[PDB]
Amino acid sequence: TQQLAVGIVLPTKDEPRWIQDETRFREALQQAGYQVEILFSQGSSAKEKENVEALIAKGIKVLIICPHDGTAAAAAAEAARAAGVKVISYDRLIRETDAVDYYVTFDSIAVGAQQAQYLVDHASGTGNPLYLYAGAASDNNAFLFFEGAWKVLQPKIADGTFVIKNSSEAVALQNKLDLTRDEMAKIIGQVTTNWDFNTAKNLAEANLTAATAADKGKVYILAPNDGTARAIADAFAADKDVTEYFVTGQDAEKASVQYIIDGRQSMTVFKDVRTLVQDAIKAAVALLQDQQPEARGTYNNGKKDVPAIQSPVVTVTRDNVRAALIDSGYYSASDFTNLP
Ligand SMILES: OC[C@H]1O[C@@H](O)[C@H](O)[C@@H](O)[C@@H]1O
């Protein structure tokens, strides 16, 4: 194999998502005969910065980095740039610095839009209960997923289709389509899962305890990713006054694919991590060759419109789980029971 002057930093092993990227990186690197070190940050911006400093000292020329905390990662990105290291922000955006060269990402606005659109497409009449949930505020993607969803849900709240049951801040904002970041942050504060299973389950339980029978029945749940969706679904499934629920997700985690098969989760947004990984490797290799990656479009990070290498996202339900996840080669059918 060849050692590449590239280092990969991922935020934590305690969010299942990053295990997918770890796996997919290792597979892609093995295929190409490349050796590249992967370090995890253990959900610590200080450790993340250390990781970057260690990689700089090992002589990396390109850093692929998914920040734990996007704004906090600014000094790490700046340290890399200061040592002549190119900075590819990966999946999540490093904020509040111009020390980001590229951003390899899925279309996160479209993830939230697709989540919300699924809920809308399955609701009729008026006064349908709507329960909102969000990611960690330290993740810029949590704001993007929420925005994408809000821009679909808000008109359907304003027109009486949905009634928000778990966020007074969202209710006070429900006739405003274009929320500021500070406004979104107030909603997210009330409905945050912190990308954590127990936190999500407990919040759903608290919400259900506060809610009355009139707020239940057939309900609509904006869950921001797969693990939090299962936690929330588990709470809602247990409430006898919830006669039916529709719940969203993303990442196509295996356990959620099984919930979808089994009728316990309604959908997931599939984000093909194989593409994200290859996009990052390709950009790194181009930079190592003193060439520019192929970026189209930008994401603003508070200081800079960062050139984007963006990949699409796809809604997966029972109707297309086989086409989207199995026929695509993402997963073996043998991973699941009773795949339609
Ligand atoms: O790990 C929590 C979440 O972090 C987000 O920034 C990633 O884009 C999601 O795929 C993941 O579910």
The domains of the chain are located at 1-107+272-311, 108-271+312-340
| SS3 at position 305 | strand
CA distance 14 to 243: 33
Contact 145, 269 (CB under 8 A): no
In a mutational test of the pocket of ligand 1, which residue from 13, 133, 195, 311 has the highest number of ligand atoms less than 8 Å from its CB? 195
- Best mutation site among 42, 65, 91 for ligand 1 pocket (most ligand atoms within 8 Å of CB): 91
Is the beta carbon of 141 within 6 A of some atom in ligand 1?
yes
CA distance 134 to 94: 19
Give dist(CA 241, CA 256) in Å, integer: 24
CATH number of 108-271+312-340: 3.40.50.2300
- Compute how many other C-beta atoms are within 10 angstroms of the C-beta atom of residue 13: 13
Q: Taking the CA atoms of the chain, what radius of gyration do you get in angstroms?
A: 20
DSSP 107-139: -HHHHHHHHHHHHHHT--SS-EEEEE-B--TTS
For a mutational test of ligand 1's pocket, the pick from 10, 17, 145, i.e. the residue with the most ligand atoms closer than 8 A to its C-beta, is 17
Q: How far is the CA of 92 from the centre of ligand 1 (A)?
A: 8
**Distances in whole angstroms, Cα of residue 100 to Cα of each of 5, 50, 104, 137, 142:** 18, 18, 11, 20, 19
Q: Pick the atom of ligand 1 nearest to 195's CA.
A: 2
CA of residue 188 to ligand 1 center, whole Å: 15
Ligand 1: atom nearest CA of 92 is 6
In ligand 1, the atom with minimum distance to the C-alpha of 66 is 6
Q: Do residues 113 and 128 touch, judged by C-beta distance below 8 A? A: no
Give bridge partners of residue 310 from the DSSP assignment.
105
- Token representation of residue 120: 């809308």
Question: Which class for 264: exposed (0-12), middle (13-18), buried (19 or more C-beta within 10 A)?
Answer: middle
Angle in degrees, CA 171, 225, 306, rounded to 5: 90
- CA 141 to ligand 1: nearest atom: 6
Report how far ligand 1's centroid is from the alpha carbon of 159 (Å): 31
- Tell me how far apart the alpha carbons of residues 108 and 17 are, in angstroms, rounded to a whole number: 15
**Close Cβ partners of 46 (under 8 Å, ≥ 6 residues apart):** none
Residue 140 near residue 184 (C-beta atoms within 8 A): no
Nearest to 87 by CA among 293, 302, 297: 293
Architecture of the domain delimited by 1-107+272-311 = 3-Layer(aba) Sandwich (3.40)
Q: Report which residue type is found at 78.
A: E
253 lines ligand 1 (CB under 6 A): no
Resolution (A): 1.4
Give the mutation target among 23, 111, 139 for probing the ligand 1 site: most ligand atoms within 8 A of CB: 139
| CA-wise closest residue to 143 among 303, 325, 299, 316 | 299
- Find out whether 177 and 156 touch, Cβ atoms under 8 Å: no
Beta strands in 60-178 (DSSP E): 62-65, 86-90, 102-106, 128-132, 162-164
Residue 230 is classified by DSSP as H
Q: Is 71 exposed, middle or buried (0-12, 13-18, 19+ CB in 10 A)?
A: middle
- Sign, CA torsion 67/68/71/75: negative
Beta bridge mates, 298: 307
Phi then psi for residue 4, to 5 deg, are -95, 145
Closest CA to 225 of 195, 189, 191, 192: 195
Neighbours of 117 (CB within 10 A): 18
* 1-107+272-311 and 108-271+312-340 have identical folds: yes
CA dist 106 and 272 (Å) reads 9
Q: What CA–CA distances, in Å, run from 226 to 82, 204, 246, 264, 294?
A: 38, 15, 13, 12, 31
Neighbours of 30 (CB within 10 A): 11
The residues with which 86 forms a beta bridge, in sequence order, are 62
Method: X-ray
CA of 17 to the centre of ligand 1 (A): 6
Residue ID of nearest Cα to ligand 1 atom 6: 141
